[PDB]
């Protein structure tokens, strides 16, 4: 797998990453309170349930539904299921349910070190992601994909950014990829180090992706001087379904041990 980068990477990184010495934890969820996610930290995204999600995706994102989003045994669980939730008011005809949480309108950050420790969702069809979008159109406002994986190639981790100049609508996105051991069976830490000068995206303290601010003051190539909010989801189909959907793979879970955000303060 590759995010339209068949014969190389467009934003190569190869350097260590770690929480900077002058940073402090400014936000966390440790997911140690069973039941629904803390509503002071997380909202459900239902914005396109009735309209249809993007990317040829197949899922309906259920809100307030423990079968799809629950805190359990020290993790956030986002679970995909093969089912039609036809009596939801915003039902959109989908054959699958999943979860999509975000901090939009509750918590956002400009610059910082973001660490998300997770075990991913497997089974052909699955497309787990950990990513960010600007609080204040798209893609000009900036998108930061800290972690994507597509479960037809479940050991490949993808790290990508999108801007007006560099984005998947015109196939000019800046990204890289790496290999992680059994990501659906063991935890890894997926990390972003975002400063005014560059972003690093990594796994387990190794940056495999680097995107520099070109310092031209062009918002089209660097929109990332404004706050972003965090997003956790498991999509179904689209890129995740490039080799089909495995009916037998459902239900499939992503387990998030924690989200930690650090900043200079
Ligand atoms: Ca935890």
Residue numbers in the entry: -1 to 134, 138 to 266
Show sentences the authors wrote:
The crystallographic structures of SCLam and SCLamE144S were determined at resolutions varying from 1.5 to 2.2 Å. All structures have a monomer in the asymmetric unit, and all amino acids from SCLam were built in the final models. The unique difference is the presence of a glycerol molecule, modeled in three alternative conformations, at subsite -1 and the position of the N-terminal loop in SCLam. Owing to the absence of ligands, the N-terminal region in SCLam is fitted to one end of the binding cleft, with the residue M1 occupying the subsite +2 and part of +1. In contrast, the N-terminal regions in all SCLamE144S structures are solvent exposed and exhibit multiple conformations. Although SCLamE144S has been crystallized with 0.1 to 0.2 mM magnesium chloride, the SCLam crystal was obtained in malic acid and all the structures have the same electron density representing the atom. Therefore, the Ca2+ probably came from the bacterial host.
SCLam, a GH16 member derived from a soil metagenome, an endo-β-1,3(4)-glucanase (EC 3.2.1.6), can cleave both β-1,3 and β-1,4 glycosidic bonds in glucans, such as laminarin, barley β-glucan, and cello-oligosaccharides. The enzyme SCLam has the typical β-jellyroll fold of GH16 family. The substrate-binding site is located on the concave face and is composed of the catalytic residues E144 and E149 (defined as nucleophile and acid/base, respectively) as well as other residues responsible for the substrate anchoring. All structures have a calcium-binding site with a Ca2+, heptacoordinated by a hydroxyl group from the E28, G72, and D258 main chain; D258 side chain; and three waters.
